[PDB]
Amino acid sequence: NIVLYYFDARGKAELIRLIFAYLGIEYTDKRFGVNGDAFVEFKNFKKEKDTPFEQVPILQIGDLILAQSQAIVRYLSKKYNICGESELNEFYADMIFCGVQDIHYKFNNTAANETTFLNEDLPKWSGYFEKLLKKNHTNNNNDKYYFVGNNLTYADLAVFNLYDDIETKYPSSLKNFPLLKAHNEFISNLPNIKNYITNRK
Amino acid sequence: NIVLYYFDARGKAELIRLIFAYLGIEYTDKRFGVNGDAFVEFKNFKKEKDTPFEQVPILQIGDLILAQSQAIVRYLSKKYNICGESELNEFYADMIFCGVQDIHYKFNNTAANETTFLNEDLPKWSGYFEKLLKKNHTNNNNDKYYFVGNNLTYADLAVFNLYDDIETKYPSSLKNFPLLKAHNEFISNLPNIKNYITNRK
């Protein structure tokens, strides 16, 4: 019953694919442009499906059409208990995801200006996450890194996906941030996540 | 106990100011640069307050420091019952807010390219909201326009603030969208919102 529609790219779909992998949820991963014309296939999709904003990702669960990648993430995270276990932890997971969006946007919008990115913004943002993880030190041992409380949240997956994307371009980016480094390794090594990354294009 | 910190601008704070107005919540509206050097005042702020990402808005409630405008909105909307009354309506309010962010971003990032904005993106996005409101037609009379369910949500305020900002620059923007037009008028005329807009710089 579940179909995720996106272009043939990680981008705005990949966090949702990571959540379904973590959760072991079966779905069809529909990708426009894998073979044919992405724009033609997308245009033909918009004809057949009622989308609210003529954008993807779209997640269809039975007859229910959901749009807006962040809103899908939040909905799924709430339904499947990866959103934090207190009103404050839920807020913190959301705050951290929102910060991931700021720096992921900068990464995505270059990086033609890469020295400023490489020397100023990326280190600075990395330090912000390093400090957030330090604050949660505190639930551990064991091991257990999480951004928020004592259990995985979508904020863990989002920060993983951010630095997974960054490391593809800039391999040494986590050398100066050992907590953030340990976090990324911890997440990448979760059975369902490791499995998914192995299978992935 | 509540202080909102931002620059002397509407921008990323204004939806939070609209929510506190709607809710009748007392707070201090702290604005950097009202008199002095905004950057100096902001730099001095970051020295005195522990911010997660060295950005504003920051909302301080007692000793609790909250960052990330969307996350603050969502937290406040949940605590004060303006987030929708079903798991699906909560998702829809979030989806609509996320769409508002897409078009508000386009508006904010010009609009040096204004004919494409004016003739393509803005009408198209306006039509998306017009259609969402049509879908909710349906809870009414009475009157009651809402995007989501039978009661106000932050999505109503966000869409109001989006078109309030747009109308300042482009007064006739809602002429072809009468539902969206009726919605904006309905929100602007809510006692606490009308009051706030009257008082506003």
Place this chain on the structure above:
Amino acid sequence: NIVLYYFDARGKAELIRLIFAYLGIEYTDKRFGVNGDAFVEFKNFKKEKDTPFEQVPILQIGDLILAQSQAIVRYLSKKYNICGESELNEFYADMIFCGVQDIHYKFNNTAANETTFLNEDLPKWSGYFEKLLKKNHTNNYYFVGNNLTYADLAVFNLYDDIETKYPSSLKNFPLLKAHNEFISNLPNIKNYITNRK
């Protein structure tokens, strides 16, 4: 007879108005939305005037329509001898103006009081122009050769634009501040600036 058409703003028209000031050329400064707005006026403009890209600035000289601010700037500079007096200096003038468009764009899109702009981009680009000025002498203050180029008026416009938002931006850049002062006091530009709104 010469008409410059733009919106009511400095923007992509300002350097052209500065060259007209410097050279003491008389022209009509048509600004949309006085008047106003804007808009509408601009949509009427496009129906009346045959622009190549439906953009402004437009510089009309008699019947002749010129578009593209940087092309307009180059054309005026070559005609009125503020483009360098060697092939190499004409290139350096050009190169320098292309550098200006680089940080000017960052300044225009760095909103607002972005720390990275103030602590990384702005200091770095300021260092570039300081270094370029240093290379051509502590004054012989000219970026290129030993007379004014449109590159001087471009760097002046840049830091003037910046300064309005970030006072004391030229503090750690002695040749650059001195260049900025030199240019602002040339009588024609001094006058243009006092009378500008």
Place this chain on the structure above:
Amino acid sequence: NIVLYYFDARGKAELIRLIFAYLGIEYTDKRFGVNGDAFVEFKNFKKEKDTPFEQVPILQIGDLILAQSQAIVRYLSKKYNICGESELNEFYADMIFCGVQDIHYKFNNTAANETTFLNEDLPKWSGYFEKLLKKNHTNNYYFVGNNLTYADLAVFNLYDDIETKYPSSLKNFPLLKAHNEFISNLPNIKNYITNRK
């Protein structure tokens, strides 16, 4: 002896490589990160070579360092007579290249298969260049005068870049498609293209 330094990409180097092809000038095409990467190499470059803005492309001729792609393009075009043979044609060539940078930027930042780009910007700008071509004759295919300018090679580069992502972009623009074909078949460019990766 001539070395063009850039990253391993078309980007802001491509039009320069196209002019070198067209004029049959021999040069070394140094691309960072073959090799590789990237990076590192580029940080080493900047320590070794005295660049004015710590950016590439850099074109070195003997000892002489040239930066800023558009300044490099103009300088080559003026030296090798592909910049127009009148003051007005030199301006139109320039104006047209400035128009190219406008939609090229939109194409480069419109990610990806943006509908507004395909239904609004691209058709509109294509209309502009069609109109410009029409104005200069159905071939006399040249944007400016009656010989090749760097403006022809700029419009060729643009639509070539586009075409790789959006096949059939030139369908409703007969002079523009014919111009694109004319240019792609000039022997020097035909050859450059087959051998390009």
